Amino acid sequence: KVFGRCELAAAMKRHGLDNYRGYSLGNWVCAAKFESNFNTQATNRNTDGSTDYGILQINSRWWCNDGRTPGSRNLCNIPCSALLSSDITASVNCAKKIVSDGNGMNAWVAWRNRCKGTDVQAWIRGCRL
Ligand SMILES: OC[C@H]1O[C@@](CO)(O[C@H]2O[C@H](CO)[C@@H](O)[C@H](O)[C@H]2O)[C@@H](O)[C@@H]1O
Ligand SMILES: [Cl-]
Ligand SMILES: [Cl-]
Ligand SMILES: [Cl-]
């Protein structure tokens, strides 16, 4: 599915992402916008043979297992196919591990380049929450 901006903000808040490990809700909504354009089925292949899956473009070399990526670590212990669900539970649970294991939200290239440093509060402005 394709989430609306405030629709995804509400769902991400219900799943505990607001201020998680120091990142306000707008960071996560902005991340999803530029990672997947709010599409839960987005997938993209990378130069290292890995693939990014889903609303938060979770990677098959480190985080989820897609059975075709050498050196797979599967640190989220989840098949990548589960991350293409319209329900964001598995993606959020894995994202909490990613942002806890390394350098914050910098793992997400699109967030790093196109969200970090801007006023991310604008991404939840006007939403019901
Ligand atoms: O995720 C660990 C590590 O991998 C890098 C390498 O570019 O990012 C990959 O994983 C991200 C999270 O799933 C993806 O969003 C990204 O597209 C993918 O390249 C590093 O940024 C990150 O620290
Ligand atoms: Cl915010
Ligand atoms: Cl854009
Ligand atoms: Cl603005």
| Interior angle at CA 35, CA 15 and CA 116, nearest 5 | 85
Approach to solving: X-ray
Q: Structural domain boundaries of the chain?
A: 1-129
Neighbours of 16 (CB within 10 A): 11
Kindly state the helix (H) or strand (E) to which residue 13 belongs, with its residue range. helix 5-14
Report which bound ligand comes closest to the CA of 120. Answer: 2
Tell me the CATH number of domain 1-129, given options 3.30.450.370, 3.90.320.10, 3.20.20.70, 1.10.530.10.
Answer: 1.10.530.10
Closest Cα to atom 23, ligand 1: which residue?
Answer: 107
| Residue of 112, 109, 114, 113 lying closest to 50 (CA atoms) | 109
Pairwise CA distance, residues 113 & 110, whole Å: 5
10 Cβ contact partners less than 8 Å away, ≥ 6 residues apart: 127, 128, 129
**Active site residue ranges:** 35, 52
Q: Point out the annotated binding site.
A: 101
Resolution given for this structure, in angstroms: 1.5
- Residue 61 dihedral angles phi and psi, to the nearest 5°: -90, -35
Q: Are 78 and 94 in contact (CB under 8 A)?
A: yes
Q: Point out the annotated binding site for substrate.
A: 101
Pairwise CA distance, residues 50 & 6, whole Å: 31
* Angle between helix 5-14 and helix 25-36 axes, rounded to 10 deg: 130
